[PDB]
Amino acid sequence: IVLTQSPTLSLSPGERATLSCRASESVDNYGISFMNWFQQKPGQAPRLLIYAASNQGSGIPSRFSGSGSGTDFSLTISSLEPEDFAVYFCQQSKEVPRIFGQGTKVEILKR
Amino acid sequence: IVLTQSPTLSLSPGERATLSCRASESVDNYGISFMNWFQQKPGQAPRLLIYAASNQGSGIPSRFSGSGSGTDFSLTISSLEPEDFAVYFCQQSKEVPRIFGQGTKVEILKR
Amino acid sequence: ESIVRITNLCPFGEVFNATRFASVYAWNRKRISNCVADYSVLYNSASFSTFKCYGVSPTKLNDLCFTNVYADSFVIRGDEVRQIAPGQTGKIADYNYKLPDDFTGCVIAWNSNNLDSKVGGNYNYLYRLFRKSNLKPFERDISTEIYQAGSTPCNGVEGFNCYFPLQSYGFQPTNGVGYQPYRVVVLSFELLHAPATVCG
Amino acid sequence: VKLVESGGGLVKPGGSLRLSCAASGFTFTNYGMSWVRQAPGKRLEWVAEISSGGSYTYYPDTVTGRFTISRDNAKNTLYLQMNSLRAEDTAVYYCARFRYGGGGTVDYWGQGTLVTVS
Amino acid sequence: VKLVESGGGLVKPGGSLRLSCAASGFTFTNYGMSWVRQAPGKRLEWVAEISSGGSYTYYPDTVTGRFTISRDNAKNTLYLQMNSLRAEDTAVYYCARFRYGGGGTVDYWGQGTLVTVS
Amino acid sequence: QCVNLTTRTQLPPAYTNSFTRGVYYPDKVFRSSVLHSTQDLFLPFFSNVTWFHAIHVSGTNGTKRFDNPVLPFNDGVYFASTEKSNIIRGWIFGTTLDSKTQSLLIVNNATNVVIKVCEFQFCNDPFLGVYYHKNNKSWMESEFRVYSSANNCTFEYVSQPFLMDLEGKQGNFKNLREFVFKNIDGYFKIYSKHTPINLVRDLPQGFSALEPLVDLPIGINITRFQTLLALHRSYLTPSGWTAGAAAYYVGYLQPRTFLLKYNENGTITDAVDCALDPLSETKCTLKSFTVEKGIYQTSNFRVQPT
């Protein structure tokens, strides 16, 4: 379909970063597990975060965790780091050329 | 233990309200962060202000800010409002049933 | 009819019933060998809040014989117990305790809120807030040198952008179930390819 | 989020008054619960307690409350059964919801409870 | 693992452009992939979509500019012939790699490709 | 500790001939008056066996010679001693004789032998020191005169003392004591025996059957070892060491096929090696200790290539 994300966060280390992936039209999956999460390091190839928002593992640090609710997907990073934040993405699937997320970036203060 | 607070304030809007929470015996925390702040609207359920005096957030407006020093805790409200003042509390913790502040209310003149 | 025909008792009791336990940052490792091990009684009692074996069955464990059994015992919060798993990334895995992905082990967790939690809080338990590099699997680090998050060197003293590697645990009764401490035991089995010191 | 309490009722001193605290909006297991009296002219006196894991039922040594807290996680309901009722028990009890581990903390409470023994 | 793609390529506008993407470290035949373009001020657009055992050759409703994908499994190289070169066609054309065990999903990504027309 | 007195001495190892010796029971299975044949590690008969001396007085005055070397384990190990007055306790069996490997430490006490499989640090001249406590008037044993460190330990066990006295006999027994040590398949098994001997030193013609004491999970390869000792302190005379005299017997095991003759009670007397001589290999073909008058065909021989 088409999706939206929470636009940005501006935060500090050791904090939770909650990122919505808000999909227009359909909500997630009939198998009840879909969408995604992705990160793109700035000026760098995009990279997976979570697939179906619930999931993955190695290559995706533990600070990435979360879920998604209907259309909305929660990209949740507890314990932020000023090194680790970069534009975050999600994907739709199961409808339309799968497309991608708001992109979203979490700023970190204390710099 | 047992605590004391600064008894009252009588002030005007747009001003700072400094409220001591003065604990007998122990001072704050070995983890260096304890006591609290609480407000009770008159004839109403008490409500949190700050926990460990340094802290919290949403549900506690920005006008609540401050810290605490040894036993003493500073409940500091800059920019007072005649709508927003109500009896203020703190808690001990880490010793005794954690009890509470004896209570403090900041009057506001210009009425 | 068929005719099938205890004595030595593996010392699980010290591992499962101790008032205080080694901290996650530095954990004692206990080797169980040359004894008869029954896991059926532990499973049947179900005293532990959760009995979990990633690649094995608890009824199968007593029948199966492991020549060397390794018990790692530490007290961690319930959220940390979820983080600790073989093949799963965890905050604990990154710093204080690392689990080999290839290794298969049984992790058993029971709530210690009644004894470990205190109104003041228990500072005896400790965890590693930060480490320069991921710890080697089944290893512990006692270094107190300040973690150098900042480009400027910490110099062994607290500074802006410098965080102490070890942070004391705080455990209280009013804490949430995830915050509340759970005693955790991890079991490593040599299994086949070794002389059978332990027979099921 | 919010709490539904057992409202105003009167007994003679010396009995045992059951209270009840319903949980609206949160997971009643994961939160230490409590009952705290605000009587008029009285500072809040932390009285009744329960932990989130097992049963702690902690009460101030002062004068024993003799309260009988329980939890039903199916009901999400805290009770306060106050044994040895007295006239001073007249007060506003607050069954309160503790937040995650921190300085305190008590972000959410009941609406206030009328309790009168006289 | 490693993806190598034909970088800096410029052609007359309204024409076509052969890309390339040498799948290195693994089997292009065993691992299906696709083409992802990024336009400044826009999110990652999903363009060419191909199958592992077959040729899906799917172009998106947004940019249906004949994305002729070639599956050179003998050369282990993912190819593309984006027709109708334009400002939308100018993009960072990283290749891709669907995870072997993912609900959607792309696990490995091309480093990125300098791609333009003006 | 690690107090050391090498006192190295010259001369060739005094050898001897084990006539019928080192036949243990290589199974738990009870058999009665049958001839059983297995090919297993043994000490083959008529073998070369070194009569070593841990402490050796060659008289002028005193002159106690502490010679006991670290000895390789090789295939398997046999051991024998008399020692009416015990001076021998256990053995250091290991590989590095140091850390980096496990250590088999057999210590006999007054009275609970505490077998130990651990990681130790064995000194250059290890042996058990014995002294007098003055508290409770008891002779203790300082065990760290053997080894400095004890840590990491893998295994521990206790049993009734393998070494045992009887005495009161003013000799005529010597209490000849044998111990066989074989390390295989994760089980290093110990064997024992106690026999009277009236001869001055060397061994008789009798058969000695050794039961397995304990079959233990050892899981380590032991390529080298040395024995242990019990010495003490003396006080001013024209410090004291080397209590009494000490000598023992050692020989190495070897795979051989024995025919085993159990008794009506399962007590093996006659054992015969097959490879001992061209005569012994035929008795293994008839399985009998009686060989009837006639010609029998023993295994073939081949000429081998240069």
The H-or-E segment that residue C43 falls in is helix C40-45
Among F8, F224, F233, F3, which Cα is nearest to F125's? Answer: F3
Among C62, C66, C75, C85, which Cα is nearest to C19's? Answer: C75
The one-letter code for the residue type at F144 is: F
Residues of chain C neighbouring F185 (CB-CB closer than 8 A): 195
Give the Å distances, CA to CA, from A3 to A95, C189, D95.
11, 48, 43
Supply the CATH number for residue D33's domain: 2.60.40.10
| Alpha carbon distance D37, D91 (integer Å) | 6
> Is D106 in contact with B100 (Cβ distance < 8 A)?
no
Residues of chain D neighbouring C177 (CB-CB closer than 8 A): 29-30, 52-53
> Is C170 in contact with B98 (Cβ distance < 8 A)?
no
What experimental approach yielded this model?
cryo-EM
* Residue ranges covered by each domain of chain A: 1-111
Question: Distance between terminal CA atoms of chain B?
Answer: 38
The two beta strands, F246-252 and F23-24, are: unpaired
> Is D32 in contact with C117 (Cβ distance < 8 A)?
no
Q: Which two tokens stand for residue B35?
A: 């006591």
User: Which residues, other chains included, contact F285 with Cβ-Cβ below 8 Å and sequence gap of 6+?
Assistant: F296, F297, F298, F299
| Alpha carbon distance E34, E28 (integer Å) | 11
Say how many C-beta atoms besides its own lie within 10 A of residue B19's C-beta: 25
| Alpha carbon distance B41, B21 (integer Å) | 18
**Chain B nearest-CA residue for D107:** B48
Q: Which two tokens stand for residue C56?
A: 């094995």
Judge whether D81 is closer than 8 Å to chain C, CB to CB. no
> Is D46 in contact with B97 (Cβ distance < 8 A)?
yes
Say how many C-beta atoms besides its own lie within 10 A of residue F33's C-beta: 10
Residues of chain E neighbouring A35 (CB-CB closer than 8 A): 104
> Is E112 in contact with A96 (Cβ distance < 8 A)?
no
Judge whether A48 is closer than 8 Å to chain C, CB to CB. no
The one-letter code for the residue type at F222 is: I
> Is C121 in contact with B94 (Cβ distance < 8 A)?
yes
Nearest to D54 among C113, C174, C175 (CB): C113
Instruction: Let me know if chains D and B touch, i.e. at least 3 Cβ pairs under 8 angstroms.
Output: yes
**How many domains does the structure of chain D reveal?**
1
Say how many C-beta atoms besides its own lie within 10 A of residue B73's C-beta: 32
Residues of chain D neighbouring B23 (CB-CB closer than 8 A): none
Which domain, by its residues, includes E27? 2-117
- The conformational region for residue A110 under phi > 0 = left, psi -120 to 50 = alpha, else beta, is left
Nearest to C94 among A57, A60, A62 (CB): A62
Nearest to E102 among A45, A51, A100 (CB): A51
> Is C88 in contact with A79 (Cβ distance < 8 A)?
no
Residues of chain C neighbouring A108 (CB-CB closer than 8 A): none
Q: Which two tokens stand for residue F128?
A: 């058990």
What is the CATH T-level fold of the domain F23-302, as seen in this structure?
A: Jelly Rolls (2.60.120)
User: Which residues, other chains included, contact F303 with Cβ-Cβ below 8 Å and sequence gap of 6+?
Assistant: none
Residues of chain C neighbouring D53 (CB-CB closer than 8 A): 111, 113-114, 117, 173, 177, 180
Q: Which two tokens stand for residue A65?
A: 């965790």
What one-character-per-residue DSSP string does D9-60 give?
Answer: -EE-TTS-EEEEEEEESS-SSSS-EEEEEE-TTS--EEEEEE-SSS------
- The conformational region for residue A59 under phi > 0 = left, psi -120 to 50 = alpha, else beta, is left
| Alpha carbon distance C20, C124 (integer Å) | 8
**Chain C nearest-CA residue for D33:** C174
> Is C168 in contact with B31 (Cβ distance < 8 A)?
yes
* Residue ranges covered by each domain of chain F: 23-302
Strand pairing partners for C126?
Answer: C168
Nearest to C67 among F157, F216, F217 (CB): F217
| Alpha carbon distance A46, A100 (integer Å) | 11
**Chain D nearest-CA residue for B48:** D107
Residues of chain E neighbouring A101 (CB-CB closer than 8 A): 43
Residues of chain E neighbouring A53 (CB-CB closer than 8 A): none
The contacts found for F62-69 with CB under 8 angstroms, 24 or more apart, are: F64/F7, F64/F241, F64/F242, F65/F7, F65/F9, F66/F5, F66/F6, F66/F7, F66/F125, F66/F242, F67/F7, F67/F8, F67/F9, F68/F226, F68/F227, F68/F229, F69/F226
Judge whether C91 is closer than 8 Å to chain A, CB to CB. yes
Strand order across the A36-40 sheet: A46-51, A36-40, A87-89
B81 within 8 A of B43, measured Cβ to Cβ: no
Q: Hey, is C76 helix, strand or coil? A: strand
| Alpha carbon distance E92, E94 (integer Å) | 6
| Alpha carbon distance F225, F240 (integer Å) | 26
> Is B31 in contact with C119 (Cβ distance < 8 A)?
no
> Is C31 in contact with F219 (Cβ distance < 8 A)?
no
The H-or-E segment that residue F51 falls in is strand F50-57
C160: buried, middle or exposed (CB in 10 Å: 19+, 13-18, 0-12)? Answer: exposed
Min Cα–Cα distance to chain F from C69, Å: 12
Resolution attained, angstroms: 3.7
B74 secondary structure, DSSP code = E
Q: Which two tokens stand for residue C71?
A: 């018990």
Judge whether A46 is closer than 8 Å to chain E, CB to CB. yes
